[model samples]
Target: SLAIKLIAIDMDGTLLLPDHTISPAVKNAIAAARARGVNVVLTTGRPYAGVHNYLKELHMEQPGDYCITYNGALVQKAADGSTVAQTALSYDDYRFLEKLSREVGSHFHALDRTTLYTANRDISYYTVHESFVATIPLVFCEAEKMDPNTQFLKVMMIDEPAILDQAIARIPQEVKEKYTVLKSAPYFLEILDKRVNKGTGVKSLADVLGIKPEEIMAIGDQENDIAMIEYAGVGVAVDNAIPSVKEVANFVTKSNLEDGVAFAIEKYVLN
Candidate 1:
């Protein structure tokens, strides 16, 4: 079998069970992958701050890899917190999102380093269950008050799924060309730099490890995961994955609760 030197996986709907915890089977599979000289890297839209505790819980403190966070805007080594790569949207883009937020009546949140700041405090509940809250600062402010130096990595617009779809349809073609637009759930539309996508992020890690793109296997379950799901050599969609995602994946595995990630690893990487 060709060695799967690197395994890039998504978090929320792929690795995390319905209760937001990693399953024992999946955890064990990751451990086995590491023992076999494979690198298991967390590729997520979560901020680095949010992902830290999971890595710690998985006893991955010495995981010997980089995490792709905020889509691909932030890539850093888990060991020393050293930055390996990053690509952020410009201030102009942030401002545009602010304006769009108003026109669409959607709540907008911006990521600044480890902080999750938002123009609407009403939406804070959406991020409360996340692991990054305490160590990661959160600021509540109006769009007009956002600080330009904060280095915006991603912007999220929360509304009804139908409304979000309408908004996406109306987004200027120019803006679409400059950024990657992803919808994780029907109600959430996220915007990131064009280069800051799961596919590119994983590609960066593979390049650093001297592994070819086709040698990697990736698993995910959302529209945001589309790029990596389509581009990776072996792309897998969890059973709960949306129709659009399943259409592009090489294989559709069992649901997250059924340990789909571990099953895929065993069938492919561990075969």
Candidate 2:
């Protein structure tokens, strides 16, 4: 009976297995969902580069297709990377974050639309891993020498899990109050513009398309997904989701390893 028009799914821990592979069942389900004239949006903490291959594999390159990237800092069309809506942190926010990274002894990097920039010549393994996973090129430029006019989407502090945990506790109270802080992974912490979040990104796009909130369903497995999950009519959490995520979900599907995305679609859309 649910008249769902859109299904927004997170990538890493919800749609893909630990090895980053999509099962045949999930792919087939998504294809079927599309056949029903439904929009399947990838709502993620990743940048566009990270989701490009998956989008291509899933045949989501239509002119009307869209993605919510950067934990909600950016929204763009899937076909040509045209911006639908975006929010960016100021240059001053970058400087403050970079300074905090030094004080906290964490590896800091900033992301523009297409590149990852770090002031540290000695890059953290986590930063390199992020660039690889996100499929973005990395550049090393000192904070002062970097362009002041770049529209930064987010700042990240990457390190060993333990080190990042300690650094998280040291972040200044003002930083917490001024930015949207998301611990997307144990080794990766993010700081974005306060107005940026997956919920707003989804809402903005849905409003443009004249789709009501009740017409959307969202699935995810982590803290960054909470906003969009809460925004949807049917919010789902994979069985392997964090406890908080599970607590907030309207439905709990199978784990990522069990083709959870496909399962949810089969039950809610294709049924």
Candidate 3:
């Protein structure tokens, strides 16, 4: 309503165009926010490594500048990879989720900080798309060969839309109790630590920065983004957002291709 100290933005559907490019209008808005001493933090399901180039392009890579990655599993300094807060899933959780993926007839993969690991003999196309779009290395390991000590940022069940929808319905109650499960993309069902999410991640960073909840504005267009959108003082949804996402928004801006991010920033955060 007044001065917002921090802005949390979702990457794929909220900030990026359909082609995954940032519009000049959006970039200019972010630059102006920074000039006004606002902290523009990117919140995404991508691993930190995947977000580096965007951070660099946005000039948000200063030491101590923060980003929430892995759908809020990790909050770290955008510059040097020092963590402010982090939560990781145990290897056992991977086994459970991956096993469940097979039972649900979906392809499974997990990611740590830098690599995408899949036990699937023939990798799913969506899995490869995730690796390519995230700019992370993909490794195939036999389930038996995967180390029992490897912790993961998150795990995913990737498949075709109808298949993933059926798989989502088949997920056991036990899995939901043991982890945070949500769809980052229509074809990607993700699982993370039970306590990790954009809300908790943003709250952690805001607490550390001494920025009150009322001084924060968050924008996104996906189910995975709902937590932070709810947590912020002003929650914004892009025009292309799913109905559920739009339902929770304080304001709905133009679509990503139409400068929704810029529209929201200009209305709420900018002078």
Candidate 4:
């Protein structure tokens, strides 16, 4: 904790409980850390719109505050919604994703800054999941009709939890070789541009502030969090996290249900 100057927190399984609410203990711990000048950043796969309320809850939405959204594909201003740094999938990447999803009957979509565009005319159950999570409207478009000019921050193929495995099994070799492919949830298969991830997001912001990677602590619970966790000097994983996550984490704390974020703060940041 001595060298730590920032905390990159993952949402969903790391900070928010199964109910999707930040516990009072976790909320207060975050506020306390912020007051102490610690950079408590929200690192997530959600769109900035989806993270807005949580930022407000943590009082992290002021003009200069920052968040790593879209699983590190985007690093943006917390206050004015400006892009600090961002990355997008290549058009070639999109084409193959489109083809593979069409080939496998999986639902596929991409996002600009504010909208989720789905080419699957029937509006898949997975598209509905993204719409509800992002709190952004879904627009129907044909794959060939997808706006080529819009920079896609990320591409995703969605299927049922079990079928999501089949999706992974069917991932094109080029895709596996070219993009950062991982599941933030059992049913969500996210593919981002090569070399972009939560670690890169945190690193970009930290660079702007002249902070070193060793001065950071990142906490997360899934495969996507691995990059950021590895980048941080102190990486914490929740007890409920996947085996792969726990194996790489520096510390394993209580599960999210037990206010793991709060526990980590009390033990490291606030102590």
Candidate-wise lDDT, in order: 0.81, 0.90, 0.89, 0.85
- lDDT score for candidate 2 against the true structure: 0.90
Pairs with steric clashes in candidate 4: none
Listed in order, each prediction's TM-score against the native is 0.92, 0.97, 0.97, 0.95
Better of 1 and 2 by TM-score: 2
- Model 4 earns a TM-score of 0.95
lDDT of 2 by residue, 116-204 (tens): 99999899998899888788999999999999998999889899989998998998788889999877777888789998888898899
Order the numbered candidates by lDDT, best leading.
2, 3, 4, 1
| Alpha-carbon RMSD to native, per candidate | 2.1, 1.2, 1.0, 1.4
Q: For candidate 3, lDDT tens digit of each residue in 1-271?
A: 4589999999998889878889999999999998899998999999887898999999987765899999989999988777788889987878878888889999999998878999998899998999898899999998778988776988888999999999889887887887999888788887899999999989999999999989999999888999899999999999999999999999999999899999989998774
Worst 10 residues of 4 by lDDT: 166-175
Clashes per candidate (backbone, < 3 Å): 0, 0, 0, 0
Q: In angstroms, how far off is 50's CA in candidate 4?
A: 0.4
Tell me which of candidates 1 and 3 scores higher on lDDT.
Answer: 3
How are the candidates ranked when ordered by TM-score, highest leading? 3, 2, 4, 1
Task: State the lDDT of candidate 1 residue by residue for 1-271, as single tens digits.
Answer: 3567788899988999866789899999998898888888888888888788887776665747678888878888877567899888888889988787777666677887778777776764554433243246777777777777778888887676676677777777887777798887776677998877988998888888889877888999998999988778888999999999999999999999899999999988888
lDDT of 4 by residue, 176-204 (tens): 88789888888888789877989898989
Model 3 scores worst on lDDT over the 10 consecutive residues at: 142-151
Task: Give candidate 1's root-mean-square deviation (CA, Å).
Answer: 2.1
